[PDB]
Design a protein around this nucleic acid. Structure first.
Ligand SMILES: [Mg+2]
Ligand SMILES: [Mg+2]
Ligand SMILES: [Mg+2]
Ligand SMILES: [Zn+2]
Lengths: 161, 101, 288, 99, 16
DNA sequence: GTCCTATCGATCTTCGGAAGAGATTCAGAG
DNA sequence: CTCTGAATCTCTTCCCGCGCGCCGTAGGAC
């Protein structure tokens, strides 16, 4: 039975840590002592932690800490580091399984609301609602180009609330 | 990248020309291709009024307001281009309408 | 302001909010092409005040007639730019946090007040062990740090007729637990309970300290931060140098560390991370 | 080198130091003990406020000197207000007090 | 509160 | 080439300061 | 069985001015 453990890497080199970890496993051929290696990703939690299905021998512990760009395990102590939990592994796999299905909000662009844009050359500019292109599923938002509050129209996808 | 379309409307033609030229220069300088300055038609709104305070119907004045249009389109808005345009403030009395999308 | 004495004390969280004019949210300072301050970052003109001499950032107002209006294009107040050096903001921390000074002065003011050794509160505060509180119908003491092995023991040798926590919340709870005057009234008698010089004196210290916390207005939980004030931006200016480069202006790298960590910790709290992950970020925040 | 008036630093308004900048000489720590060792109090008050740090008083002083009034309004130095905020930027409530 | 400034603090404290 | 995000979460911070004082750790025993 | 002696650890301090000289976030990903 292989239980889960948490590994800390240099945050930013995490995929390379995962690849080097799989390669160190297939070098030192303790293939019966490692199950998987998880870096979950949403359309990226957790920011710098690598999940490893593993067992605990001191040889495999030295193996994972001899993988480069790995600080160490995170647990109660450094002698016998800590697995996490049954329901916590199940919930992380639940949200990893709820992969897609991530659209946007359903709120309305109230006239007068001060907005910022989401895409385009005018992306992320200090905008303020000027009118309601409602039944178009569209938008129009004031902006400061040429110093005037010029009337500029935006797609509904260009809101930021 | 969708391209920014700009409509200039002014009662004076020289002023509108000045605005359009400045905008074109700014765009063309920042690299993006200005695709204009096309003069759209002028709206000649004519009025005919009685000049007398009371009778005499044939004594009349014909006035007219002439609205000049200029369409300046700029293809692919870049960083330099958008920021330059934003920085540049035009002459007052020239209505600009930035249609994009 | 004219004055004739100076007073110092610990600042309660509501006082620290009172000094604030806004709450900082983003780990940023000024843009990297144009050089406006990025709003709700460490320079946001509507948190602290306007950059231009007596005129506003959004451009809407530029004359003394408007002095003290607040705009609705970006929200800045039009006022003396001089006051940009006067006004503070704050950060709301996603957890309590121990203030390093009171953790590692000459003794520790925390530890001394608790009668708990410095290394052991640090052993809580950097998340190395639990500490047990409200121990109730179980075989456990009043502070008595217990290793995660020894908590996993108590989690089933006992139910929850006790508690133990980890990190700064646990110390905050311990300080909050202080029946402070009653502890002093006892200890000033327990002074007499031996003639042992080798604690009568470091106990004289402890019985002084308790009475000093009593006689001031102070309260012990304030050793622990919760709102962290941020320095008014003109005192830590991000000046440009030779060409388009900002001078590395140290504090703005430190607050940047904090606020990044706090942004992550609010995320991982509300997304409900497991203990080991939050003990990671909570350690990294306290250590920042 | 000599300086009447010119630059001031940003974090605290004391003068710049240098010849490569038009700086004012440091009336450093030991000089202040030297004034205190004469009776000289007004000289010192001036030297470390009106001549130095008090953002109001120095412009009122300058105008009083061109007017030839030979009088000062001394206030309280802005570097000391920097200190207060740098302590109050710790959770340490330091404050001025009245009586 | 020394020297000339003592004499002022003293007068301030005497007219009291 | 530009923009955004993070640090040895798979090492090795220098031995060549003295001091001087305190906080904190241990003797021989009543 | 821990009470006054002593023993090892860290923290803190080290002149005042002054003038030059230079040197001044990176790495990775899209
Ligand atoms: Mg028509
Ligand atoms: Mg007729
Ligand atoms: Mg006629
Ligand atoms: Zn404004």
């Amino acid at each position: 039975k292989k239980r889960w453990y948490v590994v800390q890497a240099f945050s930013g080199f995490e995929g390379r840590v995962a690849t080097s970890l799989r390669e160190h496993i297939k070098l030192h051929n303790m293939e019966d002592l490692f199950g998987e290696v998880m870096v979950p990703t949403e359309e990226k939690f957790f920011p710098g932690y690598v999940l490893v299905q593993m067992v605990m021998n001191d040889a495999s512990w030295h193996l994972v800490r001899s993988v480069p760009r790995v600080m160490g395990f995170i647990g109660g102590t450094s002698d016998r580091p800590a697995p996490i939990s049954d329901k916590e592994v199940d919930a992380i796999m639940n949200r990893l399984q709820q992969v897609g299905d991530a659209p946007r909000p359903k709120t309305l662009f109230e006239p007068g609301e001060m907005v910022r844009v989401n895409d385009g050359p005018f992306a992320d500019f200090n905008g303020v609602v000027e009118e309601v292109d409602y039944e178009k599923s569209r938008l129009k938002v004031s902006v400061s180009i040429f110093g005037r509050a010029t009337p500029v129209e935006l797609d509904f996808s260009q809101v930021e609330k | 990248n969708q391209r920014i379309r700009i409509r200039l409307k002014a009662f004076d033609h020289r002023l509108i020309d000045q605005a359009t030229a400045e905008i074109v220069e700014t765009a063309k300088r920042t690299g993006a291709q200005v695709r204009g300055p096309i003069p759209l038609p002028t709206r000649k709104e004519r009025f005919t009024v009685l000049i007398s305070p009371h009778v005499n119907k044939d004594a009349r004045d014909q006035y007219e307001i002439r609205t000049h249009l200029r369409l300046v389109d700029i293809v692919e808005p870049t960083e330099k281009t958008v920021d330059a345009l934003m920085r540049l403030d035009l002459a007052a009395g020239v209505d600009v309408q930035i249609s994009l999308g | 302001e004219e004055f004739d004495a100076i007073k110092i004390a610990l600042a309660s969280p509501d006082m620290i909010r009172s000094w604030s004019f806004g709450e900082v949210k983003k780990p940023e300072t000024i843009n990297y092409r144009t050089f406006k301050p990025e709003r709700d970052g460490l320079f946001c003109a509507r948190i602290f005040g306007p950059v231009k001499d007596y005129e506003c950032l959004c451009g809407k107002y530029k004359r003394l007639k408007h002095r003290g209006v607040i705009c609705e294009k970006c929200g800045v107040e039009v006022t003396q730019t001089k006051v940009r050096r006067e006004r503070m903001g704050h950060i709301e921390l996603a957890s309590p946090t121990a203030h390093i000074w009171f953790l590692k002065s000459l003794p520790s003011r925390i530890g001394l007040l608790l009668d708990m050794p410095l290394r052991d509160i640090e052993r809580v505060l950097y998340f190395e062990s639990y500490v047990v509180i409200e121990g109730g119908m179980t075989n456990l003491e009043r502070q008595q740090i217990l290793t995660e092995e020894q908590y996993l023991d108590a989690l089933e040798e006992f139910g929850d007729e006790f508690d133990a926590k980890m990190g700064a919340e646990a110390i905050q709870a311990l300080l909050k637990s202080m029946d402070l005057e009653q502890e002093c009234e006892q200890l000033r008698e327990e002074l007499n309970e031996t003639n042992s010089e080798t604690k009568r004196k470091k106990l004289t210290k402890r019985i002084k300290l308790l009475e000093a916390f009593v006689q001031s207005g102070n309260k012990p939980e304030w050793m622990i931060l919760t709102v962290l004030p941020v320095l008014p931006p003109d005192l830590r200016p991000l000046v440009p140098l030779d060409g388009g480069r900002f001078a590395t202006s140290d504090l703005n790298d430190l607050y940047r560390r904090v606020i990044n960590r706090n942004n992550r910790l609010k995320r991982l709290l509300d997304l409900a991370a497991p203990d080991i992950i939050v003990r990671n970020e909570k350690r990294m925040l306290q250590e920042a | 080198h000599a300086r009447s008036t010119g630059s001031y630093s940003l974090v605290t308004q004391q003068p710049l130091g240098g010849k490569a900048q038009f700086g004012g000489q440091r009336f450093g720590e030991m000089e202040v003990w030297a004034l205190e060792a004469y009776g000289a109090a007004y000289t010192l008050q001036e030297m470390l406020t009106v001549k130095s740090d008090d953002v109001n008083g120095r412009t009122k002083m300058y105008k009083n000197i061109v007017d030839g009034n030979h009088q000062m309004e001394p206030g309280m130095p802005e570097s000391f207000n920097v200190l207060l905020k740098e302590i109050r930027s710790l959770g340490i409530n330091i404050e001025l007090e009245d009586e | 509160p020394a020297g000339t400034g003592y004499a002022y603090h003293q007068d301030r404290m005497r007219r009291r």
